[PDB]
Design a protein around this ligand. Sequence first.
Ligand SMILES: O=C(O)c1cc(O)cc(Oc2cccc([N+](=O)[O-])c2)c1
Ligand SMILES: O=C(O)c1cc(O)cc(Oc2cccc([N+](=O)[O-])c2)c1
Ligand SMILES: O=C(O)c1cc(O)cc(Oc2cccc([N+](=O)[O-])c2)c1
Ligand SMILES: O=C(O)c1cc(O)cc(Oc2cccc([N+](=O)[O-])c2)c1
Ligand SMILES: O=C(O)c1cc(O)cc(Oc2cccc([N+](=O)[O-])c2)c1
Ligand SMILES: O=C(O)c1cc(O)cc(Oc2cccc([N+](=O)[O-])c2)c1
Ligand SMILES: O=C(O)c1cc(O)cc(Oc2cccc([N+](=O)[O-])c2)c1
Ligand SMILES: O=C(O)c1cc(O)cc(Oc2cccc([N+](=O)[O-])c2)c1
Ligand SMILES: O=C(O)c1cc(O)cc(Oc2cccc([N+](=O)[O-])c2)c1
Ligand SMILES: O=C(O)c1cc(O)cc(Oc2cccc([N+](=O)[O-])c2)c1
Ligand SMILES: O=C(O)c1cc(O)cc(Oc2cccc([N+](=O)[O-])c2)c1
Ligand SMILES: O=C(O)c1cc(O)cc(Oc2cccc([N+](=O)[O-])c2)c1
Lengths: 134, 141, 141, 141, 141, 141, 141, 141, 141, 141, 143, 141
Amino acid sequence: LIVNVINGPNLGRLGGGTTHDELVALIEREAAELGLKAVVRQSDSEAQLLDWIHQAADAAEPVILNAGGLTHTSVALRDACAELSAPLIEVHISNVHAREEFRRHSYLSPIATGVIVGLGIQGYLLALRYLAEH
Amino acid sequence: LIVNVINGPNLGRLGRREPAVYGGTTHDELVALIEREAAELGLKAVVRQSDSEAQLLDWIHQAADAAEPVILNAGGLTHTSVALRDACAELSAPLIEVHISNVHAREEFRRHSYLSPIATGVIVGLGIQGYLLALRYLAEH
Amino acid sequence: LIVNVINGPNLGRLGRREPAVYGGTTHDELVALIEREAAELGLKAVVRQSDSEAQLLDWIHQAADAAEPVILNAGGLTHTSVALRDACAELSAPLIEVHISNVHAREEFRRHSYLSPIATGVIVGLGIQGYLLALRYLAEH
Amino acid sequence: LIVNVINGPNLGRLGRREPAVYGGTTHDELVALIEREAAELGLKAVVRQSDSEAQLLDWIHQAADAAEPVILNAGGLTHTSVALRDACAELSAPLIEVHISNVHAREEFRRHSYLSPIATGVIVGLGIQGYLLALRYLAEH
Amino acid sequence: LIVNVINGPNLGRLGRREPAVYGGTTHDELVALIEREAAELGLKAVVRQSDSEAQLLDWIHQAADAAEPVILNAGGLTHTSVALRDACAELSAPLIEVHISNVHAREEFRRHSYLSPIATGVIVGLGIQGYLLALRYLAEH
Amino acid sequence: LIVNVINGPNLGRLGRREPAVYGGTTHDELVALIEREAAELGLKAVVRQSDSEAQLLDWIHQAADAAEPVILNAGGLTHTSVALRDACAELSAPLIEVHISNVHAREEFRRHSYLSPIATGVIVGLGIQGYLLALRYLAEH
Amino acid sequence: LIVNVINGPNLGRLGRREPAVYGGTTHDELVALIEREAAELGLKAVVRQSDSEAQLLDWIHQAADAAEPVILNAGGLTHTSVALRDACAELSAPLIEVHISNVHAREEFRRHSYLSPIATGVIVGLGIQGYLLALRYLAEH
Amino acid sequence: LIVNVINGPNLGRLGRREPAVYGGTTHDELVALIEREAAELGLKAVVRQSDSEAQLLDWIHQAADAAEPVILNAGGLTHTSVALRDACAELSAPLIEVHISNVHAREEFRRHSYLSPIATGVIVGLGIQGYLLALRYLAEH
Amino acid sequence: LIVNVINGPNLGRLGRREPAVYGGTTHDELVALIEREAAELGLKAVVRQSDSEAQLLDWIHQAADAAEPVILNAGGLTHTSVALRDACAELSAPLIEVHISNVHAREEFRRHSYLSPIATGVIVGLGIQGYLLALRYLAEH
Amino acid sequence: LIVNVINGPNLGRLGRREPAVYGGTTHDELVALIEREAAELGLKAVVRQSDSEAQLLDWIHQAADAAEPVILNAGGLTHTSVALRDACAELSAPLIEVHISNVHAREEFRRHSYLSPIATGVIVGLGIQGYLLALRYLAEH
Amino acid sequence: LIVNVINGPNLGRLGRREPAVYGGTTHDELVALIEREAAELGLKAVVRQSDSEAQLLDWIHQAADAAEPVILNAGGLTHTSVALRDACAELSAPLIEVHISNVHAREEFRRHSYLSPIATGVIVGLGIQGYLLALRYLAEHVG
Amino acid sequence: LIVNVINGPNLGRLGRREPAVYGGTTHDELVALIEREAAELGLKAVVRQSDSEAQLLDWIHQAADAAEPVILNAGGLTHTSVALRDACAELSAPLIEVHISNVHAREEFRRHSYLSPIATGVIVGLGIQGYLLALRYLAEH
Ligand SMILES: O=C(O)c1cc(O)cc(Oc2cccc([N+](=O)[O-])c2)c1
Ligand SMILES: O=C(O)c1cc(O)cc(Oc2cccc([N+](=O)[O-])c2)c1
Ligand SMILES: O=C(O)c1cc(O)cc(Oc2cccc([N+](=O)[O-])c2)c1
Ligand SMILES: O=C(O)c1cc(O)cc(Oc2cccc([N+](=O)[O-])c2)c1
Ligand SMILES: O=C(O)c1cc(O)cc(Oc2cccc([N+](=O)[O-])c2)c1
Ligand SMILES: O=C(O)c1cc(O)cc(Oc2cccc([N+](=O)[O-])c2)c1
Ligand SMILES: O=C(O)c1cc(O)cc(Oc2cccc([N+](=O)[O-])c2)c1
Ligand SMILES: O=C(O)c1cc(O)cc(Oc2cccc([N+](=O)[O-])c2)c1
Ligand SMILES: O=C(O)c1cc(O)cc(Oc2cccc([N+](=O)[O-])c2)c1
Ligand SMILES: O=C(O)c1cc(O)cc(Oc2cccc([N+](=O)[O-])c2)c1
Ligand SMILES: O=C(O)c1cc(O)cc(Oc2cccc([N+](=O)[O-])c2)c1
Ligand SMILES: O=C(O)c1cc(O)cc(Oc2cccc([N+](=O)[O-])c2)c1
């Protein structure tokens, strides 16, 4: 089945050392090393993430979500994310607890299945093979 | 490469209580899943639990001297121990903090960790599968 | 006369989610309700929904320049957009903030709203009805 | 059938100057007017006012036995009474919190309320009519 | 040999509402229970409930002046009333704060008390038996 | 020319206890002291006392009507009662808050008051003379 | 039927200090005192003291399995130990927190406990006798 | 009997800026007024004003050495200066803190003083007569 | 060199609204003014405005790519957006944060900025001229 | 047309180290830089520095008497001195608070100013040129 | 005669990693420094380290019962232990609390201590010599 | 080597004031004890005292241009003065904060210091012997 990998603001600026296009490629290759198909999408717009997230709620598909800094400010994002009936994994490339004190709070974490933080790009792959239990 | 998995207070219990939250797999079963699964990655995994803060510091020092990676679920001490943060700050190999359960979905005092700011990173919410994934990460630093 | 009923993010999507919190009626059903009711009262409701702050602001700006009353349920944005608040502060005719659910009976953070300080009034927890009680008011003033 | 409208401290003083923020309507006019509209909706209003906490509680307890609805403007006690909060908690018919001024547009302390969380909804800053709209809510259920 | 058992606002409704937090047995039977038990220990119990803060302060003053010990469940007034604390602050005989429910296992606000700092002791969450245990302490003092 | 002198909860008990913290002069002695002073200043002083919040409010309402100055010691309601503050916000004539002890040298919670922001002035720590000095102030306007 | 009395750090030197804040009663005198009164009520007290969190933790584990009750005085860990809180969360029999002193009359840091929200109830500031009253609650259930 | 009237920073500009706020009376006019009150009261008052913190401490020292009461309006330093507070704590004779305007009807930072806690009492918001009333209080001690 | 002037939400409504808070100059005038100054110093000024967080982000990215300096006014996103902050973080050229009004004179919530920490400098409350002074700096480096 | 530039504590040490946060030019060189720069604008600048708060206040007073503008760099006093604030709150001509370094990128206590709400505007983080641009703002409106 | 010198969690790793921040002296070497310094002054120091809070508490009761001075560096526990503060409150002989690093130059949570308020005095940031100056303090008083 | 011993406000009154807290040695004696002790250690120690912040800033600048160690007790300035902090940040030789009394056992606001973060070290509450121990440490370098 399908896994939605949604990246938030500033994530298209990637390049860790890997770029975003390279990240789409490693996520997909792996997904396929499992019975999984991955759809990686990226936008700097709250309304666009909102859209993708609704689309995943109607589909009832897992979502992986690294929301950038909206992790820390968006409730809109949280509320439309609660409805998700499949797992939600929150991913942060860098360790947000080792930075400014405001990064140590997330409107998403409470409603996520789980959260992976600070393990780099591999945060994405790790999450995929949590999901591969359905 | 050796890997240290260290489990703090109350992890000896498990999954003898609170299946809804903490799972249902025994601590023994867990030693066995971690070990077999690490062998399968080409690592050797030493796993221990202890309810004793002093003992966890000892093992963490040992890791520091031997320069080995650490997978640490400090349990309750996660939210209270500065002593434990300090011993871990010494580690030069990766330290991953693990939570079986999703702390951000419980009492607010659990949303705070003295260790996170000093780990390489954190897994929370993913159940037992959370170790193992930490293994995979370490498997290629 | 003319009244702009603005609904923010995750609205739309009404009736397709926790019926325990938001009722079971659609966004298309609510609008029918709103604009039938507005006639009963000799006004013309204009009802819209966007998940885009930028969009919601455009609408506010428009109601400011035509000096039309606004009934606004800003959804999530309510607890976060100083921007959204800055737009409504310019309104020269009444502004009524409306929440479907009772925000005072949920997570503590839904209890502060950037918009209320600068609204004429606020209706919370009266369900979908809240919009129609907002209409009237209005009708009077 | 019966709907209990109840006002707290200083509301006897309505109309009679203080009207930059509370209006020119006296309390007996408001009584007349809530009953005028209540009748015109099929309901029978019982409007009462007291400066006494113990009297307010006593009225609330009686509604909780009669299983009648309560529209409550507790004035200043909104912001401080847990006693008033608790008495309202047992109400099985709707409770509607109502304020004449926009509490969010004044002193910071006025922005908290012990009542909201355990009420069905709140109406704030609509003036008098705040009351009439709560009656409208009730009539529709 | 004389002991005052003073019950604050809402306690009169004990019964009667939410059997799962406050208990099944009503206020009259609480009186009756307490008086039999105070007699057993060779004490005369004067149990009294009011919804009126001024009434409570008065009872308290009488107790100060007669140097009688006092057992107190202030109700909502525990978290809010400095007057009450000031009345209490002058008892020469012991003063025991009692609450049927575990306040700490509830809303944040219930967890602060004006009374505890100037009380001899505090008994909480032990149900209606808390009053009886309070009588034991006094019998032996 | 009438000055209202108004003492809230526990001032009934002045002199009866706490010799160092409040002094040995009783409420009656105070009432007399205050009347003498008034009629040496061209004034008429009515001194009342109540442990009831409702009564205090009533008296405030009556001063607001007659446009008369108030010297007010609210005791424990100073720190807690928003109802009081609002009643007081309506007086056309000067309001002077008075405290016998130095509230600033005691528990934290006593250092804040709801009254002073809306009072002409506050005299604190000056013991019984507070009232007589406040009288003098009013004699001068 | 068996009751677990568990005392934490510092409690091993009762009476060896401060007749003022705690009793003039030693630990063994208290153990004798507890065992005896326990027998009177038809129970089996097992009183046990440790300065060690790890050892406290394991006594709690045993009691959770044995499905026995627990009277817990954790000492300073009361205010510091999430691990202690978490071990107790699992007890099926009642948990009752006991404190010789009235903690609420001391440093503000002593006025918060991690234990209380998960306990059947709490007894504070009633000296050595707080344990004997705890036994009475359990004899009763 | 010598009283010391000390005025801190900005006070030399009275009358020349504001009010009211600070009244129309100038510092020179206040000097004459305190000289006439001092005569009427049968004592002495030495008024001095300085924008300098160290000047103020020196004067305060001399008063602590000469056992003289102090009346102090310390201007901005009231809110910020621990130096002045320590200096004041030493006074054996009474210390009355005076503020011309009502500090409680302004910015929240004005509502905290470092002086009130170690002062005999505080007069606030009676304008310039504040100084006069405090001189009268000292004419008892 | 080329300077980017970016202006976020509501800045297209330069009065239009609130003359005494933001000034009488419109956005179109500001552009022309900015361009005279640019030209008068030999720079190119690109001025652009949007009510969209995504847009501003995107303009920021292409300034980061072009290594061009940015004179930014996020107008409200300033207080709320950490995303916006993350984008400016990559600016290698200098970043000037500009506010037309003095935010320190306004509600407290305007007094924190997520941007200031990473800005080169900040100019606040000099009205439209803030932008001009910010070019003048970029001219001199 | 005089403009007063006022520098507070430690600004006499400009360029005597550190590199780094404040720049290489010393206070004597800046004094002259500014005077030259005011003359090219037709202003006449008086630059003064002092480490004495009284001095500063005396200086602000003369500007208040002369209706003259003021560029103030209070240094450390900015975060601490309510006395400076009130001084300044009386200037009828523009007040520009200037800081050489970017206070928002240093310790959190440096992000708050008592001056800012009463200045006309604030320039932060543009180094020595801060002063130069404040003159430029002043050569207008 | 006797001074109890007690070190808490983590002090066993002094100078054995990392810093800089805490000097480059081993705990063993510190034990020696303090003991020779204590002899020069005509005192006998007992120097103990433990990562175990029960062990720290235990040494403290003993110091309380013997009425001997404690010079204490509780390391991690300083910021978190109420258990430790209560045991220490019993000391009627002088209690001087020591820190090798400057706690006020570091993370906020390190700037509060449950121990300072019941200590005679505190030395912070004077490195290893913190300990010696406390010994000198004890020895300039003495009757 | 020359060591600068700087004492702030109120420390000239040392020894003639609550010896309970500051002990009974005067300030002149203190000068001698320090001078003497410094000689046997082989250092020249200049000791200075002022109540004036400017005077303290100046002494520190001199020490900073000299590159000489400072032993500093700012008294009350420690908790308030940022100006003082910044003057000390500039010192290249070690700086020792010294407090005669144990600040951690007095009022809470004394438990913070603007100086400790930037000082080599602090000695607190070991009385006057603290200044000597600061010399002893400086001789070691
Ligand atoms: O994945 C994160 O660790 C993360 C955490 C955040 O608080 C924000 C965030 O978005 C970005 C914030 C800055 C930069 C980049 N980037 O792609 O170079 C992404 C990413
Ligand atoms: O792994 C966690 O998510 C976790 C988080 C905590 O805040 C504490 C914690 O330790 C336990 C706390 C209680 C029980 C069990 N258990 O083994 O059923 C473990 C574990
Ligand atoms: O109208 C509300 O009660 C409300 C309150 C909020 O704090 C957020 C909010 O946005 C929504 C959040 C989730 C769902 C829906 N919906 O109507 O399907 C709306 C709506
Ligand atoms: O209904 C209110 O808006 C309201 C809110 C309060 O916080 C207090 C309150 O009581 C009053 C407070 C002041 C005046 C009047 N009055 O009827 O002129 C009423 C009324
Ligand atoms: O006894 C208590 O547990 C208690 C705790 C409180 O915070 C308030 C209190 O007063 C009441 C508050 C609500 C209800 C009832 N009641 O007797 O049904 C009593 C009672
Ligand atoms: O809340 C106060 O700080 C306060 C201040 C007062 O001057 C009076 C007051 O009411 C009383 C509070 C306690 C005692 C008495 N009394 O006259 O025995 C009165 C309370
Ligand atoms: O039992 C208590 O009231 C208590 C409360 C505390 O905050 C701490 C505590 O641990 C102790 C702390 C100091 C002494 C003793 N003791 O039994 O001599 C016990 C005990
Ligand atoms: O006496 C006061 O009300 C007062 C309170 C303060 O917080 C500061 C204060 O200092 C002054 C602050 C500004 C002006 C004047 N003045 O007399 O022209 C005095 C005066
Ligand atoms: O939130 C602010 O502090 C803020 C400060 C500004 O200088 C601008 C700003 O954005 C605006 C918010 C509201 C209106 C207008 N406007 O251009 O009339 C701008 C917001
Ligand atoms: O001008 C500033 O940016 C500034 C900000 C402060 O928080 C304090 C301040 O005073 C000084 C603080 C340290 C040094 C110097 N100096 O002249 O080298 C000045 C200056
Ligand atoms: O002595 C200190 O400055 C100190 C301060 C602390 O906040 C903790 C502390 O214990 C240690 C904390 C970490 C390391 C080491 N060590 O001996 O390398 C000791 C020691
Ligand atoms: O030396 C101290 O511990 C100290 C701490 C302070 O917070 C202030 C302080 O200044 C003094 C404050 C009051 C008196 C005296 N004195 O020398 O009698 C000094 C001194």
